[PDB]
Design an enzyme around this catalytic site. Structure first.
Site: not given
Ligand SMILES: Cc1ccc(NS(=O)(=O)c2cccc3ccccc23)c(O)c1CC(=O)NCc1ccc(C(=N)N)cc1
Ligand code: NA
Lengths: 276, 10
Positions: A70, A126, A225
């Protein structure tokens, strides 16, 4: 090979300030500054155009970098980088400075995204590889991490066992660090992971983080990420990358956990690509 | 707020 043995630590028989925490368990928000050379496999994925951090990543050989899919491809947000859009920066500590005589900046030959990376639903699988145009020279600050074998994965991927996450991402869910950040976090029981979210969790994921009642905090966040979740094997004193920072709902929220790509479960694909 | 990297890196 010589993977997972850090020039500034294992190679000279020095311990970093928190690695003992990991060993004691083998029975970035709320992290700390990394020590110099603490994570010599850490890679920064760097956008050329708006010169900015794109993601973390890791060095697994002199020509191959591992990251989250991603970081490179996520259609819902109109993300689809090509090789020319970015650089990898290796050997870094400071987030923003050009670290003259220390970091090395490499261009990408080719990006490989897992063919069943599920960007449509839950970020299953991922994982992505980047082949570099030129091999990078190893140094005190640049050195590859090991990838786990089945036995190391089975022995260490147990609830309560801590690994370590590193990155230059947000310090809060809603500032940025001057230098690379580090946090040690315990792996969480699969039922607790599943019960913390509405997302469908797969066997290609695991979660980590402290529970609300455990008191201690910490999490990865936006910008972390693609970076590594690593564990130091008590059998051979080498660092192994068990996870890739994938997703989480906010950052360091009580009752939520960070999710990580299960590197061992996807290792057949990794080897397939590298064998070419 | 990123320091300019050497132009040789494209
Ligand atoms: C591509 C993507 C899309 C959505 C989200 N947000 S999410 O995690 O709520 C999520 C994960 C899986 C499927 C989803 C479908 C619908 C809406 C949200 C989703 C996401 O976190 C990412 C990846 C991302 O942005 N990662 C950054 C990140 C890294 C680590 C953390 C953490 N460990 N708190 C949080 C965020
Ligand atoms: Na939490």
């Amino acid at each position: 090979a010589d993977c997972g043995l850090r020039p500034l630590f294992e190679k000279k028989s020095l311990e970093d300030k928190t690695e003992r925490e990991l060993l004691e368990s083998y029975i970035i928000v709320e992290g700390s500054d990394a020590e110099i050379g603490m994570s010599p496999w850490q890679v920064m994925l760097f956008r050329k155009s708006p010169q900015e951090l794109l993601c973390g990543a890791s060095l697994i050989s002199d020509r191959w970098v591992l990251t989250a899919a991603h970081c490179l491809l996520y259609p819902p947000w109109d993300k689809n980088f090509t090789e020319n859009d970015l650089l990898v920066r290796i050997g870094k500590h400071s987030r923003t400075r050009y670290e003259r005589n220390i970091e090395k900046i490499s261009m990408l030959e080719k990006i490989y995204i897992h063919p069943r990376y599920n960007w449509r639903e839950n970020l299953d699988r991922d994982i992505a590889l980047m082949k570099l145009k030129k091999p990078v020279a190893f140094s005190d600050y640049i050195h590859p991490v090991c990838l786990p074998d089945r036995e190391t994965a089975a022995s260490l991927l147990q609830a309560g066992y801590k690994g370590r996450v590193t990155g230059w991402g947000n310090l809060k869910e809603t500032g940025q660090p001057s230098v690379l950040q580090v946090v040690n976090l315990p792996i969480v029981e699969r039922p607790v992971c599943k019960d913390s979210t509405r997302i469908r969790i797969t066997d290609n994921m695991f979660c980590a983080g402290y529970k609300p009642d455990e008191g201690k905090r910490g999490d990865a966040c936006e910008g972390d990420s693609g970076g590594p979740f690593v564990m130091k094997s008590p059998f051979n004193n080498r660092w192994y990358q068990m996870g890739i920072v994938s997703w989480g709902e906010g950052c360091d929220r009580d009752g939520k956990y960070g999710f990580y790509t299960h590197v061992f479960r996807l290792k057949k694909w990794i080897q397939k690509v590298i064998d070419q | 707020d990123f320091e300019e990297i050497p132009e040789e890196y494209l």
